[PDB]
Write an enzyme that holds these catalytic residues in place. Structure first.
Site, PDB file in Angstrom:
ATOM      1  N   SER B 123      36.329  42.314  39.026  1.00  0.00           N
ATOM      2  CA  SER B 123      37.187  41.583  39.572  1.00  0.00           C
ATOM      3  C   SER B 123      36.826  39.937  39.943  1.00  0.00           C
ATOM      4  CB  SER B 123      37.283  41.472  41.257  1.00  0.00           C
ATOM      5  OG  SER B 123      38.614  40.967  41.850  1.00  0.00           O
ATOM      6  N   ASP B 150      37.734  45.009  34.842  1.00  0.00           N
ATOM      7  CA  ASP B 150      39.127  44.289  35.438  1.00  0.00           C
ATOM      8  C   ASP B 150      38.376  43.033  35.975  1.00  0.00           C
ATOM      9  OD1 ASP B 150      41.271  44.397  36.836  1.00  0.00           O
ATOM     10  OD2 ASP B 150      41.562  45.950  37.691  1.00  0.00           O
ATOM     11  N   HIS B 226      40.967  49.687  40.531  1.00  0.00           N
ATOM     12  CA  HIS B 226      40.265  48.743  40.964  1.00  0.00           C
ATOM     13  C   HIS B 226      39.129  49.044  41.060  1.00  0.00           C
ATOM     14  CE1 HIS B 226      39.137  44.338  41.577  1.00  0.00           C
ATOM     15  NE2 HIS B 226      38.919  44.699  42.679  1.00  0.00           N
TER      16      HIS B 226
END
Ligand code: CA
Lengths: 297, 298
Positions: B123, B150, B226
């Site tokens: 992230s 991600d 996520h």
């Protein structure tokens, strides 16, 4: 719908470890998982297995409490000098007699420990140590009201058990009042890698324990999983590969063990006696395959 | 032995070098390294926002199990609003600390081949690392690869966490390191209405890869979310904030581990074996890799 015990507990949880640096300092380091949400909560003790770190049991603890429970698992020493498990037995007793004045102090804000409701549980050797304390061989200021056996082991074999060989090989011989639960890993008996002996030797297998149990006594077995599969996934592989390892999501059984436990405790420390029953009636609800599963009252 | 997507033969150990260790780490760091000694490459994983490096232990172990000393910086709360700089600088400090510090904490005998150093993030952690690579900072050690778990640039197109690395112009990334963008198909999905998508669109795995430049590779776990790669002992109180897949989380943990493990092997050993196969037939992966695209210069 049925039971959401296997499902994650709604109550949020907080991880707390006393490093003997927080007054009242504990007898030994213990990991404390308690719902941050306020409200009196029941309390339970888990005994780490030999060559195992309480931290390796994080998932199970978190879920258990997430469903509403205060769990405190001490990290006993290597116990090299102490013969058998006597040292571990006493250490837990000390922790137990330490909970009354220490748990409230460390407990998160709003969390109060209804120590009046207390239960003991152990994995492998840890399970031996516990049942021992439950058998009252040692002494504890508080009084237990439930006993959960995480696939407990007793020793290499009948002729060689840890101190003392609590096993008597006489059915229903455990003079304990606390209702007891014994979860079993089916592959525990199955050996692996050859060089490494069975982690769950028969005779000392959870089976003999459940047998010597006195109604009330509940019994469930994770058929497709291993003695150490419940350990957290991050489990140091060089510390877990020893035991056979089921071909399935370790997370699954971890959730299954959590559910079985909460139901038992709910039906002991708690008041609800229905989740465990529904399980008993339809074990299929479980994520894994619970077989065999029998009840004695 | 095509044993990817599975534990590496090397036994691994976890060491939390604390500020109270010498040389003192610039910032607390969790180092998971093979217990056995030998020439082990080094890689840096940057955790996401409001996350702890302890949450990545499983993935760390699986990767390390394939002979990789991994460094997990534990970033702290960023006082600078809308500012990744603090973390970027902290990561860079960690790099220069690697040389003198790492061999002093490594299992006695284990030695790091710094020459082969890799950087990875999750992230906002991905933003942090991609930033360092693009060269927002200068680390004496020169990394040799970039992986994005991600990556999350920021809130939205008009709201990127500064530095706004995104340009929205293909292969704009002026870096000379191979890039791997592992995304999640559920990262752009909202949850509970009150919780906006953790991997917002227009700042997710879709563009991050586009701006990457050959060699550049793209893989997406359509079956997971996520945070689904975080360990299972996660706080949950935080993990739930992001969409959660229904498939075994541990499956994804190993899937991501392998994709990464290979990419590392391909850029630091040019074995180009497991990676080529995965790109050739994603089916080998336990989970569902979709889409999967690679743009090698040749
Ligand atoms: Ca962990």
């Amino acid at each position: 719908a049925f039971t959401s015990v296997f499902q994650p507990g709604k109550l949020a949880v907080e991880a707390i470890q006393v490093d003997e640096n927080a007054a009242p300092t504990p007898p030994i380091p213990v990991l404390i998982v308690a719902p941050k949400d306020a409200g009196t909560y029941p309390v339970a003790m888990l005994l780490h297995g030999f060559f195992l770190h309480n931290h390796f049991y994080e998932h199970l603890l978190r879920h258990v409490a997430s469903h509403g429970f205060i769990i405190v698992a001490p990290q006993f020493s290597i116990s090299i000098i102490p013969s058998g498990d006597a040292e571990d037995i006493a250490a837990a007793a000390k922790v137990a007699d330490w909970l009354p004045d220490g748990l409230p102090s460390v407990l998160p804000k709003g969390v109060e420990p209804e120590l009046s409701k207390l239960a003991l549980a152990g994995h492998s050797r840890g399970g031996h140590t516990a049942f021992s304390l439950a058998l009252g061989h040692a002494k504890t200021q508080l009084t237990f009201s439930a006993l959960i056996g995480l696939d407990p082991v007793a020793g290499t074999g009948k002729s060689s058990q840890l101190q003392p060989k609590i096993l008597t090989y006489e059915p229903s011989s455990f003079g304990m009042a606390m209702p007891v639960l014994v979860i079993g890993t089916g592959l525990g008996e199955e050996k692996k890698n050859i060089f490494f002996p069975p982690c769950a030797p028969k005779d000392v297998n959870h089976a003999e324990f459940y047998r010597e149990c006195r109604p009330p006594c509940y019994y469930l077995v994770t058929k497709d999983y291993g003695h150490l599969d419940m350990l957290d996934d991050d489990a140091p592989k060089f510390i877990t590969c020893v035991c056979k390892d089921g071909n399935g999501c370790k997370g699954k059984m971890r959730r299954c063990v959590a559910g079985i436990m909460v139901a038992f405790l709910n039906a002991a420390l708690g008041e609800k006696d229905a989740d465990l029953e529904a399980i008993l009636r339809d074990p299929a609800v479980a994520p894994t395959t619970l077989d065999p599963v029998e009840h004695r009252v």
